[PDB]
Structure formats: C-alpha cells, structure tokens
Amino acid sequence: LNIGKKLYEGKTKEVYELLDSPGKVLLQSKDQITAGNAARKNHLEGKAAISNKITSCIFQLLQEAGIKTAFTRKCGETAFIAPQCEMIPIEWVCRRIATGSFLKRNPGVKEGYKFYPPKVELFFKDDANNDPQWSEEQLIAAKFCFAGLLIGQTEVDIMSHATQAIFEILEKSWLPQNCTLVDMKIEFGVDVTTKEIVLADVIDNDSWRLWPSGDRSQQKDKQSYRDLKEVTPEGLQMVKKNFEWVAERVELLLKSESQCRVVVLMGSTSDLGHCEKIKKACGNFGIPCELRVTSAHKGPDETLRIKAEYEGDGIPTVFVAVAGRSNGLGPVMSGNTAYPVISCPPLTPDWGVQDVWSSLRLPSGLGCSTVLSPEGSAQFAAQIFGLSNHLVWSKLRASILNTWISLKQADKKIRECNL
Amino acid sequence: LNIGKKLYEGKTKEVYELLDSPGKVLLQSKDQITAGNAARKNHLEGKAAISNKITSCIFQLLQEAGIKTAFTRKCGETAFIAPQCEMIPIEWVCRRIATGSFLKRNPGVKEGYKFYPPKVELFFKDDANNDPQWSEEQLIAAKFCFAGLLIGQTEVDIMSHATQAIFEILEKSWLPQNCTLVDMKIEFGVDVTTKEIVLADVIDNDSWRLWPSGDRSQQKDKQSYRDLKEVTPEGLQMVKKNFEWVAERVELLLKSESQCRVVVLMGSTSDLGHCEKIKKACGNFGIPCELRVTSAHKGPDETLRIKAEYEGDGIPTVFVAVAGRSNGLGPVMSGNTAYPVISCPPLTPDWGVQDVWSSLRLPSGLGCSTVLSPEGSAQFAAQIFGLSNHLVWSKLRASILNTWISLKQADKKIRECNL
C-alpha cells in the first residue's frame, strides 16, 4: 500500500495519492470533531473508525443500489480507497422535516413541517462567510469547470435530482431501524478519469440528522455536539456514545429484511428465451428467479402441485405466467393462489392483437395482471417486493434517477445538431 | 353615483363603499407618486388618470382573456368599480429577465439572465420591514383567512400559477408594440361574495418594468423615478413623459393585429349538429366561424369554387372538413389549398374505427391533420391563430390556467371523502 503526497487536508480527513494505483486516492479519517467557524474543535478517540465505517457501509449501500459514487473499497479501520475526483464546492442539502437553518431562514415555519417531495438547497463552500445559500441561478453563473466539465444547467439539474434520490434511499434504508432521517448534506465531484459527476466526500454522522422513533431529543447525529452550551469531557462522552450507537447499527442497512422470489411458469420450452429475459431482469433487482415448465391445459394437476411447492416453503413469491396463444396458465394460477400472478405472454405481431385478450378479460374473482414487456414483468415484480424490501426499492429508485440522467445526456448531445 | 365611507386609504389610491351597489367598491387613483419607505413622494398632475387608464385597459384585457379579476368597469378619468375583496397581503412578482432585487439577493447573476419558465417570488406586505421575501412554506404557516377562505397549499399553488399566466399574457400583449415586459408585481384578493381568489389591487406603470426594444436605458416604467439620484422638477417631467408614453400605447393591447376565420365544410346537412359544436367553440376563442355545405364526391367543382372564395379575400383561414364515412372532403381540400385543413369526422362507435383511416392514411403531398373532438378542432384552430394573434393566444393561456384550477378544486373536494 504505497502512499504518495498529501493532496488535500481538511478538518476531519486527509486525501493521499496512491503511486501503485493511477486515478485512485486514499481518504484517511482523523480522530477530530468540529462545529462552526470559531474554536469548537476536539480530539475524540475512535471517531476516525466510526466515520470510516459509516461512510464505507453507506457508500457500499448507495453503490449497490446503482448510485454513481466515488468509492472503491474500505482500506483498514480508518480509511477507504476512492476514484480521484475534482470536488464541486457546493454543500447539497435535502430535507424531509424542517429544522435547523431552514427555520432560521424561514421565520414562521414550525419544527416538523414535512416536505413532499424532499426539499433540496445549495450552500457555497467558503468558511470565511459561513457557507452562504446559493440559488441554482448563482451556481450556473459561476461557470465552474472541474476535470474539464463545465457545470451548467444540465449538471446542476443532475446534482439536484441525485441529491433527492440519495436522501430517499438513505431515508428508506434507516426506516427498518425505527430511525427518521430528517435531512442530510452531501458533496459531488467530477471523476478525473470518467468525467462523470459522482457522489463524493463522505457520508457519516456529521452528514445527517437521525431521530430514533422520530424524536428530536433522542438525536444520534453531530447535532448533539453542535447544541452543547459548553464542551465538557462528560459532554464529549455522550456525543461519542451517539456516534457509537449509529456505528453499531449502520451495517444493518446492508441486510435484507425480507426474502423475495419470482417463479416464471412456461407452458412450453419454445418460450424459454422470453423466460430467460425475465430471469436476467430479476437479477438486476437482486431477486432470485426460478423457471418451471407446466401446462394448465395438458397437465393442470401438475400446475397446482408446482404452485403448492412455492406456496408452502414460506418464501414470499410472485408468479409470472408465460403462455402463448390462449393463455390458461395465468388464469388457473391466479384463481388458485393468494400470491400475485402476472401474465407476460410472448406476443408477436402475427397473432398478438388476438392472443392478449385471453390474459385481459378474466372471470370475476381473478386478480391476474398483464405486463407485455418481459423486462417490465421483472420490474413490476421488483416494485411489489420493494414495498417490503428496502434493497429492491433502492435499486428501483436509483434506476429512475439513472434513466432520467441518460435522457438529460442524450438531449445534451442532440441539442448540438441544432447549432 | 352614491359614494359611502372611506374603506382603505393607500399612498396612491383610496377605496370607497357604494351605497347603491352591494358588494362593489370604487378605487379612486390619486395624483401622487412614491418610491421606497423614506420620503421619496411627489405630487404629479395627470398621474391618477394615467394609472386608472392603464389598470382599466389591462384588467379589461385580462378579464376578456378569462383571468378572474376584480374589475367591473371604468368610472370616469381617475376611478374604476370593482367587486369588494379582502386583499391577501402578498406581493407576487414574476420575472422573465433578472434585474432589480433579483440581482441583490443573488450576487453573481448578471443583468439579462432569462427565466424559462418565468420565475415567481412572494414578498410579505409590511412597510416597517421593507417587504421581506417569503417562501411558500412561510405563507402556508401564516394560516391567513380572508372572507372565510383559509389560504393553504391549494390557494398558494393557485396564486403562484395565476401569477405566471398573467405575466405571460401581459408579456405577449406588449410584444406587438416592440416592448419587453421584464417583470411585474400583482396582488390577489378574496371576492367577499364569490369567495374566489381573483387578481385585484391595480396593474399600472408602478407594477412592471417595460423596456422598448428590450433596452433598459429606454425604461418607460416607475424605475425611471426610483433611479433619480435627486428628484428635481426637470426629473419629474421626464418620469411624467414615460408614464404618458405607456398611457398613449396601452389601449392598443386591446386591438387585434390579425384577422382570423374558421370555415367548416360539411358534406351533408345531417352533420350540422357536429358543425354547430365547432362554431360555438370558435366563439369561445373570439374567432368568426362560417358553415358551408359541399360534397367532394357529388360536387367537386363547387368544393373548389367555395375554397377559392375564402382563399381570395385576404382573410387568414383554417378549413375544418366534416365528412362521415369515406372522408374525401378533407383530402381534396388539403390537396388544393396552402391554408391548413383539419378533418374532424363525426365518428360514432358503429363504424368510427373503420371510417377514421380515410382521414389518417393520405397520399404524399397532403398536410391534412385529424382532430376527433369537435371542441378540440376549434381549439386546434385557435392554437394556429394564436401564433399571430395575442388575443386568441391569451384565451388559450388563461384556459390552461382555469382548467388546472378546476382540477385543484375538484381534488380538494374529493380529498374530503378520504377523512
């Protein structure tokens, strides 16, 4: 592990070059806590390890969801390796609940006002003037350029949208711990190699407000330190316990709270290719997916026996019925299970206009849905599992963001042919 | 004209009761100009008449577009009659071009930054503290109640949307005079009788920034007075000329700059009812609409002769072809005029699925469009005329607003069944 020159030095972390690794850096956390732009600063033993653990869990969580993030791997108790970025000097805040500086800048608004959707604000990084709020108009007018990327309307719109998606994913991920994510701050950078804007710096207990059971008086974040009238060593021990409480629970955000399974039932092996597309698409959402062959018309006894094997082992299941021509498979399955059934018929333009009505017009007492896209049927099945599984939900949420970013990037490209 | 007690008294106008007229008031303008919350104040002869003329033209313009507005009629040189309202103490600003206080509150943004869509801001009315900017969150938290209407999320969303629509309509209306509407301020009230939020107070030369040829140095609005280092009587005469310049041109916003006509051609008198719906709908947009009877199949010589009568008199024309069954009327018309042709076939569920393809799949060199809704065909024809006629455009723009407000009101009603 061949460390090079000190590239940047902050109040709680240092970034070093790696002579062994082109375009990667090491972020070393420090045993230091700070607040405000006066002399609130303190040595706190174990803080480097707590900070590094939290940002390492959180970045792994966001990266595995599909959020583009400056994170390679954890690297000992107190550092992590990241792709080298040029930092954008903006603090991006997202709020679910109005507290803190939102109340100061908006007198009359009360503690607890809820933002639907979550509110995004920008602060320019400058300690000298205590990080003043900026409009999007101010950020665009600054004509910032980092690793050769000019930060214009498109880039500002992307960091704004991503800030909201990242908040939403962290908010959903803390929920199973009975913790309310109130707000957070993040920073983005331009990856010097890819030129992509990515989540960067760190996310740790300085980055957010976390209320157990949504109770402010139980705050576990750095606000406990900000709020001390006087820093005593008894005060610093409470703040340390709060950091430890977060650190003891953060790894559980990477844990699945619910098992998920899709079972694709096909009436014929000639539909196998259509079924492989559903299975592959389920893999993108981290949902195990099984293929089976059964015909409602030639083997209805066996259809019900197979159904029962999946009903009976306790694993929450979505069935996808793939039957061409007169689809009896979705209907018979739909009528005989309390679990959801999705018909995804392998329609073609020859007879598809005729065949689809066998999936759509069903007798009463049948919940059976229809999704024509095979990738769509997996996505629908993911949306069902996302109601009870934060990891699936997070991949769906990040996927909304990434698709939207792709449109922005494609419109930016085509906009050039208009000059 | 039986005047009653003085109800409110401001710096430039007074509101009186009308003993003869329940729920109506008289707004009397004054020969007074003011700026800021120090001693910039001056008698200016003819200002009452200039102010009253401008707000009377502008309110007539907005009201005839379909913007809900506290305006009954002009009432002498220096007053106008209005429905009685309880004023909402918010200054609603809309901007196309960043200047003025937008530059002070956003250092770094340059004179001339364009807002797409136009930017809406709120300022709380309070002279003591110089009208501080409010967030929507602050306005909602104030829980203001006027004529019994609680001002919540829905009401704030309506005033915000209406502010933008009113700006857009004034902006479009000034364009034919080569004047750039840069920004404006308006106020809304709750009509004490209807309980509807309506545009109120006044719109005059104090209300906006108007740049001839988009040149700031040619400003014709009250900014000319705000900007004087020292008020001299030579300075006040320039400001008076600027007010007179606006007053001499404002009546021209009520003038049509282009003639518009729809001609509905029907193959049979059995389709007349369908044609009456198009004609009535054209009336809603102030577009004259003629009905004619001609068959492409039984009288194609006559179809072309009628076409030529409308092509030949100089009046810009949209043709609507109404032919049931195999529509030959739209095609033959489309092929023989440079003017737009819209097929609006009187489809019914009996044979409509079969009949529509005769309007849709045309030989090359035919521009002919299809609009199934008869009210839709008039609206499409209005959208075409709105490219060259600000009065039509303004009715279409106000109609977007009003329809959106109707949805907000219907969602507010149905939301009650969920409690």
Ligand SMILES: Nc1c(C(=O)N[C@@H](CC(=O)O)C(=O)O)ncn1[C@@H]1O[C@H](COP(=O)(O)O)[C@@H](O)[C@H]1O
């Ligand atoms: N990370 C930071 C910072 C921050 O960088 N603070 C330093 C001060 C400084 O470095 O200048 C400190 O006092 O901790 N301030 C707020 N937040 C977070 O951002 C969201 C907004 O908080 P608000 O704007 O309401 O203070 C909440 O989640 C804070 O934890």
Ligand SMILES: Nc1c(C(=O)N[C@@H](CC(=O)O)C(=O)O)ncn1[C@@H]1O[C@H](COP(=O)(O)O)[C@@H](O)[C@H]1O
């Ligand atoms: N009507 C007013 C007022 C206004 O009420 N002003 C008074 C002062 C006062 O009464 O407190 C005056 O100085 O004229 N200030 C701005 N505007 C208009 O609102 C938009 C925003 O202007 P900005 O906020 O940039 O000054 C532009 O069109 C101004 O003409």
Ligand SMILES: Nc1c(C(=O)O)ncn1[C@@H]1O[C@H](COP(=O)(O)O)[C@@H](O)[C@H]1O
């Ligand atoms: N096509 C089927 C099947 C089946 O295929 O099992 N069972 C009932 N149906 C038909 O659906 C309509 C609605 O019937 P219900 O909603 O009362 O079951 C009827 O015409 C029935 O014969």
Ligand SMILES: Nc1c(C(=O)O)ncn1[C@@H]1O[C@H](COP(=O)(O)O)[C@@H](O)[C@H]1O
């Ligand atoms: N249906 C009509 C008429 C007409 O009705 O006058 N004129 C040409 N067509 C047909 O449209 C197709 C496209 O032809 P063009 O686009 O080259 O006119 C052809 O098959 C033609 O016979």
